[PDB]
């Protein structure tokens, strides 16, 4: 089966490099060569070129040609980004493109990396506080229950949020963060579960906010 | 070079309706052996994007019938013949004949469903917080159609002004619907200057305002 695993989020300050990671899987580089592009959130899709993951050949866009280095090892692919600005804050994704040994690359784009975020600051990062949204009588509904975990005060984007270590994915609504005046993100995740559950199963949020290295498990008890 | 513009950049679609989206090409896209590299992706809210159509008119298996693909030189369109509640999202096109690869701007599928009335919950300060000197209170918006809703906190009765942050969720894959979360936030102090914190809720799928509320004690 086919995987294009990235790293992790990261945030770098303005002047410094970027190293993102793209881990392939189900496929071979002999006849798939790796894209990388990215998307700035009111923008659309910038490319910013592609690699022979066998003889390590590149092809960068003009755009990014003076400050960009694609390379690999066994793999996985790299792509570094020098030389940063504010306007290089963006989701960075890898992508896969099929070569045939006669015509070359095909001018397509098949399988995707999920993406990682990079955001360019000067201010210093900040792990996030998480308090519990615990279900009350002013909580259930038709025989539903709605319990959460309130993420606060981190900086930057963004905040990764499971429950129960991925076993809970049914009605988790993760909402988009929110800016404070503080300067700082908050963001909640709520999820509905069965009110005569209360009491029989366990319910954690899993917060994990990889720019600070921070990850929370907190425990809701009604 | 090579601009790549995208002719609806947003489209309320009612489910079993059809859609188009066109793409237009600066220059032809026509490469080598008459192959024209034209590409349709799709990206739905939190993911990331996924191959409808390759070449022009081209459809992998396990992208669904109900996805076709036709044009030629520098006019191209995406056709979806009855919209589900999993074609939320916004659409690309790529076109793959000459570097650097270029996209439209993409067009939003905005899609349309029944009203549904919001789920309205509350959310009490934790433990934990008050003990750190803020207060934050929840409102919670569950699963409604349409995304118009109104929250006002109300605090004793008077209504709050500015100390309040909120935030919509995009279009659900499923039920087509919309969550909305408030957070109101004071100091511990303010929080134990009051007692009634109630948050008022204004939706179309309600007859008349739902008030949720909990008091200090
Ligand atoms: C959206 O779909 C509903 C359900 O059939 C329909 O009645 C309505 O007219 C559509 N659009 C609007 C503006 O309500």
């Known amino acids: 089966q086919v995987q294009l695993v990235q790293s992790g989020a990261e945030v770098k300050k303005p002047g410094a490099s970027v190293k993102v990671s793209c881990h392939a899987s189900?496929?071979?580089?002999?006849?798939?060569?790796i894209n990388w592009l990215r998307q700035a959130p009111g923008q659309e899709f910038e490319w910013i070129g592609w690699?022979?993951?066998?003889?390590?050949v590149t092809h960068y866009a003009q755009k990014f040609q003076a400050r960009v280095t694609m390379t690999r090892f066994g793999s996985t692919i790299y792509m570094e980004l020098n030389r940063l600005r504010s306007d290089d804050t963006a989701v960075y994704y890898c992508?896969?493109?099929?070569?045939?040994?006669?015509?070359?690359?095909?001018?397509?784009?098949?399988?995707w990396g999920q993406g990682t975020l990079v955001t360019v600051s000067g201010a210093s990062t900040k792990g996030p506080s998480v308090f519990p949204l615990a279900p009350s009588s002013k909580s259930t509904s038709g025989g539903t229950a709605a319990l959460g975990c309130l993420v606060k005060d981190y900086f930057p984007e963004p905040v990764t949020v499971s429950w129960n270590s991925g076993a809970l994915t049914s009605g988790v609504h993760t909402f988009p963060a929110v800016l404070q005046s503080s300067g700082l993100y908050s963001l909640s995740s709520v999820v509905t579960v069965p009110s005569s559950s209360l009491g029989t199963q366990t319910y954690i949020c899993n917060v994990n906010h990889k720019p600070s290295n921070t990850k929370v498990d907190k425990r809701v008890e009604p | 070079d090579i601009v790549m513009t995208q002719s609806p950049l947003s489209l309320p679609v009612t489910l079993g309706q059809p859609a188009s989206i066109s793409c237009r090409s600066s220059?032809?896209?026509?490469?080598?052996?008459?192959?024209?590299?034209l590409n349709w992706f799709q990206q739905r809210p939190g993911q990331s994007p996924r191959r409808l159509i390759y070449?022009?008119?081209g459809r992998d298996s396990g992208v669904p019938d109900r996805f076709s693909g036709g044009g030629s030189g520098t006019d191209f369109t995406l056709k979806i013949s009855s919209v589900e509640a999993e074609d939320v999202g916004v659409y690309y096109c790529?076109?793959?004949?000459?570097?650097?690869?270029?996209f439209g701007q993409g067009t939003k599928l905005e899609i349309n469903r029944t009203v549904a009335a919001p789920s309205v919950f509350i959310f009490p300060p934790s433990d934990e917080q008050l003990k750190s000197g803020t207060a934050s209170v929840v409102c919670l918006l569950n699963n409604f159609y349409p995304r118009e809703a109104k929250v006002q906190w109300k605090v004793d009765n008077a209504l709050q002004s500015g100390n309040s942050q909120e935030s919509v969720t995009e279009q659900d894959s499923k039920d087509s619907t919309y969550s909305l979360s408030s957070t109101l936030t004071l100091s511990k102090a303010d929080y134990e200057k009051h007692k009634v914190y109630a948050c008022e809720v204004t939706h179309q799928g309600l007859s008349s305002p739902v008030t949720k509320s909990f008091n200090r004690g």
């Open positions: 992508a896969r493109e099929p070569y045939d040994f006669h015509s070359g690359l095909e001018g397509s784009l098949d399988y």
């Open positions: 189900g496929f071979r580089f002999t006849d798939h060569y």
């Open positions: 690699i022979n993951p066998g003889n390590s």
């Open positions: 220059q032809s896209l026509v490469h080598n052996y008459g192959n024209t590299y």
């Open positions: 070449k022009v008119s």
């Open positions: 790529m076109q793959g004949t000459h570097w650097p690869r270029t």
